[PDB]
Amino acid sequence: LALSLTADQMVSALLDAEPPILYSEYFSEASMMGLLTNLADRELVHMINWAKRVPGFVDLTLHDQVHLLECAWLEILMIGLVWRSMEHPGKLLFAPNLLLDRNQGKCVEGMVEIFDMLLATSSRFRMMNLQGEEFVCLKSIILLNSGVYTKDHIHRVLDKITDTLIHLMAKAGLTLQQQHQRLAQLLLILSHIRHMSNKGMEHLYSMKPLSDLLLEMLDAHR
């Protein structure tokens, strides 16, 4: 199905499937993680529903759908964090009522190095002036790609999203050379998002009051 849509129809489907910006409750080591784990737990429920609305995801085996989500869940959480933190340089917007700075990261030990990489990615999205239509494409790519080598259908859907990305850039005035360069620049950031996820996953297992779902996700990376 996903193969038979226009690049515009692809974008509109992604934008419409977008999960909402959740709020947290209304620091220290236990309180900070508490708010984050609570937020992430509620975000995951929406993510699973978002995943099923990503073109070509339902067309996969249920086992495959579980595999992709378990491998990419923290990446998808992070790239969403990075995206909505764009208009707040130097700070990380976890929730509209939960804005944190670098100094505030010093409560959870080992978490400040992740925060720096997250801010850097955010300032990168800022510098690139990343568009929302491009952000939803990157997020869909992360979902389908991160666990694909752990397939033939997925690679065709990924190609479709690549076509969609170029479509957005071509419809913005960027030359062919500028399209290749921007595409490459965006995808290289995904390598860093993968790195942050791996480092973040590490510290979560080092701490493991996580929920059942959040613990099921983390045990998949064990």
Partner: peptide, 9 residues
């Protein structure tokens, strides 16, 4: 895994 249930409902 409860993840199977969420993905089906």
């Amino acid at each position: 895994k409860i993840l199977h249930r969420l993905l089906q409902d």
